Amino acid sequence: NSFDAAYHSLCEEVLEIGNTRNDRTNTGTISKFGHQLRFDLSKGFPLLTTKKVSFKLVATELLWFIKGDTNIQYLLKYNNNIWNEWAFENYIKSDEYNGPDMFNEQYKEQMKQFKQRILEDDTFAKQFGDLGNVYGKQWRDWVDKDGNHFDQLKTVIEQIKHNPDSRRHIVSAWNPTEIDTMALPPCHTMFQFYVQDGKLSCQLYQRSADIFLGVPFNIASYALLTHLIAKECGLEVGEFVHTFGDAHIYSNHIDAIQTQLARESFNPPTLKINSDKSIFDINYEDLEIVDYESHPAIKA
Amino acid sequence: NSFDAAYHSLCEEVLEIGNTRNDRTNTGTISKFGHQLRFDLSKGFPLLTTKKVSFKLVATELLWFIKGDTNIQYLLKYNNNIWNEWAFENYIKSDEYNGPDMTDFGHRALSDPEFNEQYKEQMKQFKQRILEDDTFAKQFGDLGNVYGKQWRDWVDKDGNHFDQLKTVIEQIKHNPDSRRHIVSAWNPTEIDTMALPPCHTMFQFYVQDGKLSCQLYQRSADIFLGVPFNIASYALLTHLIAKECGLEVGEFVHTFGDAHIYSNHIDAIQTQLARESFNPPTLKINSDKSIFDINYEDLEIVDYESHPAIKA
Ligand SMILES: O=c1ccn([C@H]2C[C@H](O)[C@@H](COP(=O)(O)O)O2)c(=O)[nH]1
Numbered sequence: 001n002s003f004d005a006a007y008h009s010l011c012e013e014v015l016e017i018g019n020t021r022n023d024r025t026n027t028g029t030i031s032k033f034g035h036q037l038r039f040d041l042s043k044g045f046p047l048l049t050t051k052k053v054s055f056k057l058v059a060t061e062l063l064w065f066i067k068g069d070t071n072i073q074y075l076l077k078y079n080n081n082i083w084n085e086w087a088f089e090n091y092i093k094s095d096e097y098n099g100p101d102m103f104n105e106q107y108k109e110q111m112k113q114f115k116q117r118i119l120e121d122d123t124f125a126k127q128f129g130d131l132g133n134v135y136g137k138q139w140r141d142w143v144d145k146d147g148n149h150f151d152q153l154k155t156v157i158e159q160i161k162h163n164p165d166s167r168r169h170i171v172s173a174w175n176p177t178e179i180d181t182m183a184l185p186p187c188h189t190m191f192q193f194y195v196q197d198g199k200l201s202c203q204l205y206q207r208s209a210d211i212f213l214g215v216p217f218n219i220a221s222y223a224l225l226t227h228l229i230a231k232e233c234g235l236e237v238g239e240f241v242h243t244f245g246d247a248h249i250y251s252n253h254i255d256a257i258q259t260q261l262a263r264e265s266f267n268p269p270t271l272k273i274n275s276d277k278s279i280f281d282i283n284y285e286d287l288e289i290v291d292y293e294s295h296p297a298i299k300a
Numbered sequence: 301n302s303f304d305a306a307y308h309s310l311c312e313e314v315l316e317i318g319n320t321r322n323d324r325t326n327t328g329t330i331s332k333f334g335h336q337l338r339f340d341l342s343k344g345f346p347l348l349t350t351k352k353v354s355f356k357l358v359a360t361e362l363l364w365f366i367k368g369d370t371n372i373q374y375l376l377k378y379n380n381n382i383w384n385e386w387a388f389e390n391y392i393k394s395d396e397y398n399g400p401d402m403t404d405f406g407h408r409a410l411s412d413p414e415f416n417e418q419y420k421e422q423m424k425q426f427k428q429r430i431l432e433d434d435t436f437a438k439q440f441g442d443l444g445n446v447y448g449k450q451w452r453d454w455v456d457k458d459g460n461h462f463d464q465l466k467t468v469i470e471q472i473k474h475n476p477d478s479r480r481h482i483v484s485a486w487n488p489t490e491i492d493t494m495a496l497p498p499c500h501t502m503f504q505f506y507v508q509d510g511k512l513s514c515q516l517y518q519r520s521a522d523i524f525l526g527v528p529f530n531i532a533s534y535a536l537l538t539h540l541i542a543k544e545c546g547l548e549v550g551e552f553v554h555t556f557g558d559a560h561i562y563s564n565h566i567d568a569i570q571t572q573l574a575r576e577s578f579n580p581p582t583l584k585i586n587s588d589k590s591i592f593d594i595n596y597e598d599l600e601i602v603d604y605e606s607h608p609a610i611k612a
Pocket residue numbers: 024184185187208209210211213214215218479480
């Protein structure tokens with residue numbers, strides 16, 4: 001299938017022509033700079049079949065960004081943990097955390113009890129569960145000097161609806177004045193929407209991509225985004241175009257990738273949004289992945 | 301050659317599978333959305349050869365951007381007229397313009413060939429006076445609608461300034477391997493008011509093996525008029541930073557959102573596509589100064605042979 005094939009190409013290319021380099025994580029990567037993939041969303045939803053990718057995690061995180069929630073309770077409600085450490089690293093400093101300094105036994109335990117309290121205590125949730133360092137902010141809430149809030153996402157839905165032909169369907173997630181502070185500054189620096197023959201397309205620019213762990217996930221995020229915008233502007237879906245800067249496979253992943261590349265695909269699933277509510281009122285329950293079949297998951 | 305080949309393919313592809321659409325200017329284009337071109341800078345410097353491109357215009361614009369000069373007197377010394385319209389318009393509104401009402405000209409200059417004589421006549425003096433009277437230049441040479449602003453001077457809520465260019469040059473020096481070498485021109489809080497929202501929304505540097513690469517995301521591209529110029533800016537920009545950072549050049553990677561040939565350029569493209577290439581030129585930079593202190597004189601393009609210019 002074309003989606004898997006696209007990604008298999010990228011994997012293959014990086015293995016063949018990539019350059020061996022050190023990285024900030026001291027893991028080492030084999031890497032290529034600049035690369036472009038395409039995905040026809042008319043051929044279904046591009047959730048990889050040669051390795052399980054979790055629609056729940058992807059859809060939950062993305063709706064979490066688009067709702068402009070910065071509070072990890074919503075994520076925990078669905079058992080999405082992705083952003084747990086980021087918030088834990090705040091909990092551990094304060095006049096609340098009364099456990100060991102932040103062995104693998106203890107942390108693992110201590111993560112649990114934290115998670116516990118964010119769910120069960122509402123007001124402890126508001127307390128620590130609200131990290132603010134995310135995409136969800138950059139999209140819906142960007143500040144100018146004079147304290148005005150801009151909302152890139154609303155604006156582009158209105159400009160797509162009433163001036164489709166424009167070439168300024170841009171959403172940036174890169175604030176130059178917020179980088180040096182940033183926990184982990186964005187990998188998805190900005191994206192662009194395009195409209196032709198009633199079809200919407202999206203190109204993303206990812207400055208930095210972990211091919212084994214991140215791409216598959218992100219591909220799914222940006223495919224789902226398109227679909228959402230598309231539906232909200234009453235359009236059909238076109239392509240997602242995925243542009244990379246540093247596309248890298250970590251050295252601890254070569255085998256994991258090798259195993260993957262030796263697997264044959266299944267047909268891709270399809271996606272249903274079962275509602276006519278504004279996509280900012282859309283809940284995870286309103287999304288449906290039909291006949292998703294994948295080979296099981298691979299491990300680091 | 302590989303550079304012309306790359307540019308040709310783009311045209312070639314757009315012409316074939318691009319889609320008829322209407323645009324903001326009501327000119328109509330044929331457009332593809334999503335494309336990526338590479339240019340190996342070790343092979344030479346990518347001034348197109350199937351059509352003459354003015355290194356002078358390219359380099360003087362770029363040096364002007366990166367130096368943070370807001371004043372077009374500089375541009376005019378090199379016969380760079382890229383920004384002469386905005387400047388005439390302000391002037392001819394001011395009360396110390398004592399020539400004929402040049403009110404909303406252009407449509408009106410094409411229209412009326414007695415006026416066009418007065419128009420060309422007045423532009424010639426404005427231009428001459430910008431060059432000859434520094435006073436007059438200070439007071440009428442000076443804009444704000446610029447890429448250099450965002451590269452060099454991005455201000456936050458509290459009035460701290462962030463100079464991206466200089467920050468990445470440092471970060472390249474101290475942390476080549478970082479995947480965070482980013483310079484952005486897209487300030488969403490300002491997009492709704494400004495004259496011409498940047499087409500070059502952002503770019504990224506990369507270091508491998510003593511070599512600096514650069515990828516440009518261009519959200520919009522006039523394949524015919526702008527791209528040949530744009531290729532050479534970013535190529536020059538790759539050299540300049542590589543030199544400030546004590547590195548050699550690798551590749552220019554060029555990504556596009558809306559790559560379009562405007563409807564009235566098909567004719568021009570067709571002629572160009574029919575021509576054959578010369579070996580590309582090379583770029584020497586003849587100075588050991590900071591790139592912010594470097595002058596157009598210090599640049600040298602060597603062995604540029606190309607077919608004649610075209611226009612539309
Ligand atoms: O959505 C994401 C987020 C992160 N990463 C990867 C890219 C890098 O491996 C790492 C971020 O590190 P820097 O590029 O910031 O060093 O995580 C992704 O691939 N996708």
